[PDB]
Ligand binder design. Structure first.
Ligand SMILES: [Cl-]
Ligand SMILES: [Cl-]
Ligand SMILES: [Cl-]
Ligand SMILES: [Cl-]
Ligand SMILES: [Cl-]
Ligand SMILES: [Cl-]
Ligand SMILES: [Cl-]
Ligand SMILES: [Mg+2]
Ligand SMILES: [Mg+2]
Ligand SMILES: [Mg+2]
Ligand SMILES: [Mg+2]
Ligand SMILES: [Mg+2]
Ligand SMILES: [Mg+2]
Ligand SMILES: [Mg+2]
Ligand SMILES: [Mg+2]
Ligand SMILES: [Mg+2]
Ligand SMILES: [Mg+2]
Ligand SMILES: [Mg+2]
Ligand SMILES: [Mg+2]
Ligand code: NA
Ligand code: NA
Ligand code: NA
Ligand code: NA
Ligand code: NA
Ligand code: NA
Ligand code: NA
Ligand code: NA
Ligand code: NA
Ligand code: NA
Ligand code: NA
Ligand code: NA
Ligand code: NA
Ligand code: NA
Ligand code: NA
Ligand SMILES: [Sr+2]
Ligand SMILES: [Sr+2]
Ligand SMILES: [Sr+2]
Ligand SMILES: [Sr+2]
Ligand SMILES: [Sr+2]
Ligand SMILES: [Sr+2]
Ligand SMILES: [Sr+2]
Ligand SMILES: [Sr+2]
Ligand SMILES: [Sr+2]
Ligand SMILES: [Sr+2]
Ligand SMILES: [Sr+2]
Ligand SMILES: [Sr+2]
Ligand SMILES: [Sr+2]
Lengths: 150, 142, 49, 142
RNA sequence: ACCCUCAGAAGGGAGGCGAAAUAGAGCAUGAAAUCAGUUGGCGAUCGAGCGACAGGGCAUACAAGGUCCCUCGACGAAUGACCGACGCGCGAGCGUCCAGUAAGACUCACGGGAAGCCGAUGUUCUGUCGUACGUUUUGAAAAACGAGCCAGGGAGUGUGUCU
RNA sequence: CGCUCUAAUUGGAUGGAAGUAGGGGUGAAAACUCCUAUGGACCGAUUAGUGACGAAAAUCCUGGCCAUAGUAGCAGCGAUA
RNA sequence: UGUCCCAACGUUGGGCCCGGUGAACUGUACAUUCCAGUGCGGAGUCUGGAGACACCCAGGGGGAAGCGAAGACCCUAUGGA
């Protein structure tokens, strides 16, 4: 598992983490990238809109074959990874919760840092023609989130 | 309130005229990197020098641009070869007794990294009193 | 006999692999193979006096 | 759209290649040059074989492309480009600080460069850039 | 342990223990390949053995390197003048004298200056040269063969006899 | 030049050894050395020895890993649910 | 009698976009190429020119003497059956 890769002042900061989540690591880099800098509350509203299909998530690196989306600004390819988005909603729920329990205005805090890290693959095997089997794995993803007072 | 190195830190050795001339030359002429051929093209190939042995090797055949190949002609002047850039001849020291017989006007001392702080303190004060410069001194807040 | 207790055979040309003796899909016996024999090891018959 | 040229050359009755060579030399030396009256520049030889050459350049091509200019404007500008390392920084800079014009958009008159002049009273076998362009099918806008 | 969060004996947060939890369970150390985030340099008009050697930009906590730059002067190898005077050539130009003089790489001294400043390191730009490596071969950049990448593994050894 | 272990002689280490990472110095070079961080217990030098002693390559071996790619497949069969 | 002249329209399943799941082949390096030439005479990488703003989607497969298999042909071996 990871450790926070960035320093954080406990007096004006709140943290949260996801562990070994079996979801697209590629969708996670995309989502992290997109919500960094936003306010928790904005992030949440943004991710609810993605899951609802009203807001696409720019796919700038893992974009092969991805169709263009008119609402993607400054870029072309985008999608709606609702699974990894729900995992981030859990992360944000935990973060904002911690934030509040400490006396902060959770929803109003800025996402100072958010990054996904691939911690491994849950291994699987798939039978194929001609007597062989090939890999059929699940990515395991850790993601860190640091909220910071405005 | 600030850090200061122990010992004769700013000390310089006395060199004959011909030695200062050759020291200055070595420093002006320098030498090529002499890294192994194509070490930059493959991570599994380290920089450590290996004679290019390929029958068709471009560096072996001596093509301009493929880097210089190690030859005796690149050797530094005998009279200065191995001297610290300050001009001192280095003496490896593992304890106080190693300071004995060292000429602080011509040699500087280098305390092995493996030597502890307790013993380094003694070596350092005995070196200064013997007029010997310590190349890798301890910095104390004075 | 270390490294030699195996009937490992090479498949030869055909399956895009180097001609290395294999058993149960594992390379064996030869010196370049992990778990293979020692090419020129210490020998008991050597006169060390 | 205004071109502060340090030099204004008059190509009228001047050998194109000889002017081109000096304009390139000067552009590389950092001069901003404006070649004027390009349509009147001249090129020696049999009009028939000269034109056959430029027509071939017009017919050459394929998907990648071989866009050859037809106006005296570009013919001349291209002639100069072939004398400049236009793909290198210094070469592109020189090339871009040179411009060719149909007629003379300036108030000042250009100067005639030494050695580039052709005496019509002593020559009959020569052609005019304008004549070449018209043959190539250019729209005689000049 | 207790507390908060959560669908939750999960996970997360805060907290407790210990010299150390970046010793919290395949739990000493923790390389490379490589991944996330980020810092420096380059970057959407431009060309490909990825560099070597020179020289510029930008970047640089300390430590382990401390030099570097400009005026002038001294020394001054090979080489080596202008100008001027005189004399030749149809001409481009040349000879003789000035003169082996002025100059001349390195090194040193005086005076002044730099501390991202000199070295060095990262990256990039310019110049010159440059179509990997190993092997096969008369001839390899080769449209001949080998390797996806990294780490570790991986080939003159013993006895007897002879020289 | 470097690696392993043996012996003699002689040193270093919890006032921080080996290793690793980044960085400074030396050597034509093999490679040597220092600084800082990490690490938390072992490590050298000289001399004479010992040898399962040095890798870029063998469609070399084993392990790990990237691009491929969020791609192919998750349709086709007289049983379209 | 749509085999053909000479093709058209339609049906079902794919293809395309979205959620989820999620491989493999292949990879010396670099790589935006084109026309000529050169070169072990069959070059994206050498030379000269030409062209060339970056990225992405769909496509049919011209080229990489494409990938797959240490040529089953031919010869050679004081080889095998
Ligand atoms: Cl992934
Ligand atoms: Cl020598
Ligand atoms: Cl064309
Ligand atoms: Cl060019
Ligand atoms: Cl004429
Ligand atoms: Cl000198
Ligand atoms: Cl041998
Ligand atoms: Mg697609
Ligand atoms: Mg079967
Ligand atoms: Mg390398
Ligand atoms: Mg074994
Ligand atoms: Mg561990
Ligand atoms: Mg080799
Ligand atoms: Mg001894
Ligand atoms: Mg090894
Ligand atoms: Mg594809
Ligand atoms: Mg064969
Ligand atoms: Mg036959
Ligand atoms: Mg037979
Ligand atoms: Na991309
Ligand atoms: Na858009
Ligand atoms: Na848009
Ligand atoms: Na066995
Ligand atoms: Na024996
Ligand atoms: Na002509
Ligand atoms: Na054309
Ligand atoms: Na630089
Ligand atoms: Na070969
Ligand atoms: Na070769
Ligand atoms: Na070839
Ligand atoms: Na592979
Ligand atoms: Na293979
Ligand atoms: Na039909
Ligand atoms: Na094709
Ligand atoms: Sr991409
Ligand atoms: Sr130490
Ligand atoms: Sr065969
Ligand atoms: Sr000229
Ligand atoms: Sr804690
Ligand atoms: Sr002189
Ligand atoms: Sr290896
Ligand atoms: Sr070995
Ligand atoms: Sr993969
Ligand atoms: Sr179905
Ligand atoms: Sr089917
Ligand atoms: Sr070219
Ligand atoms: Sr297709």
């Amino acid at each position: 598992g990871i450790s926070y890769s960035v320093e954080a002042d406990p007096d004006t900061t709140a943290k949260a983490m996801l562990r070994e989540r079996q979801m697209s690591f590629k969708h996670s880099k995309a989502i992290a990238r997109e919500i960094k800098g936003k306010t928790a509350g904005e992030a949440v509203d943004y991710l609810e809109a993605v899951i609802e299909g009203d807001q696409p998530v720019p796919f700038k690196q893992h974009n092969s074959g991805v169709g263009h989306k008119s609402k993607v600004d400054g870029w072309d390819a985008g999608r709606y990874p609702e699974k990894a988005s729900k995992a981030f909603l859990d992360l944000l729920e935990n973060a904002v919760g911690n934030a509040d329990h400490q006396g902060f205005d959770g929803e109003a805090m800025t996402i100072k840092h958010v990054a996904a890290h691939k911690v491994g693959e849950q291994q699987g095997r798939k039978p194929r023609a001609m007597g062989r089997a090939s890999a059929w794995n699940s990515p395991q993803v850790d993601v860190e989130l640091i909220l910071e007072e405005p | 309130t600030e850090l200061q190195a122990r010992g004769l830190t700013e000390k310089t050795p006395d060199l004959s005229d011909e030695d200062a001339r050759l020291l200055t030359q070595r420093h002006r002429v320098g030498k090529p990197q002499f890294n192994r051929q194509d070490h930059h093209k493959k991570k599994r190939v380290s920089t450590s020098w290996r004679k290019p042995r390929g029958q068709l090797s471009k560096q072996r055949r001596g093509i301009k641009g493929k880097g210089d190949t190690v030859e005796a002609g690149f050797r530094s002047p005998t009279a200065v070869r191995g001297k610290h850039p300050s001009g001192f001849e280095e003496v490896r020291v593992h304890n106080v007794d190693d300071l004995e017989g060292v000429d602080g006007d011509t040699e500087a001392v280098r305390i092995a990294s493996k030597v502890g702080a307790r013993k380094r303190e003694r070596i350092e004060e005995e070196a200064e009193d013997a007029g010997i410069r310590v190349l890798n001194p301890t910095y104390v807040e004075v | 006999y270390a490294g030699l207790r195996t009937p490992a055979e090479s498949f030869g040309s055909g399956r895009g692999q180097a001609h290395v003796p294999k058993l149960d899909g594992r390379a064996r016996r030869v010196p370049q193979a992990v778990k293979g024999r020692s090419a020129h090891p210490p020998k008991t018959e050597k006169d060390r006096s | 759209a205004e071109f502060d040229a340090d030099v204004i050359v008059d190509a009228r009755d001047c050998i194109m290649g000889r002017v081109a060579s000096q304009v390139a030399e000067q552009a590389l030396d950092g001069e901003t040059v404006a070649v004027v009256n390009a349509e009147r520049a001249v090129i020696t030889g049999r009009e028939e074989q000269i034109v056959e050459k430029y027509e071939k350049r017009v017919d050459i091509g394929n998907d990648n492309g071989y866009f050859y200019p037809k106006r005296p404007d570009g013919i001349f500008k291209r002639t100069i480009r072939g004398m400049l390392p236009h793909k290198k920084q210094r070469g592109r800079e020189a090339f871009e600080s040179v411009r060719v014009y149909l007629g003379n958009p300036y108030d000042e008159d250009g100067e005639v460069l030494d050695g580039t002049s052709l005496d019509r009273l002593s020559n009959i076998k020569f052609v005019t850039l304008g004549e070449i362009s018209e043959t190539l099918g250019a729209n005689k806008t000049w």
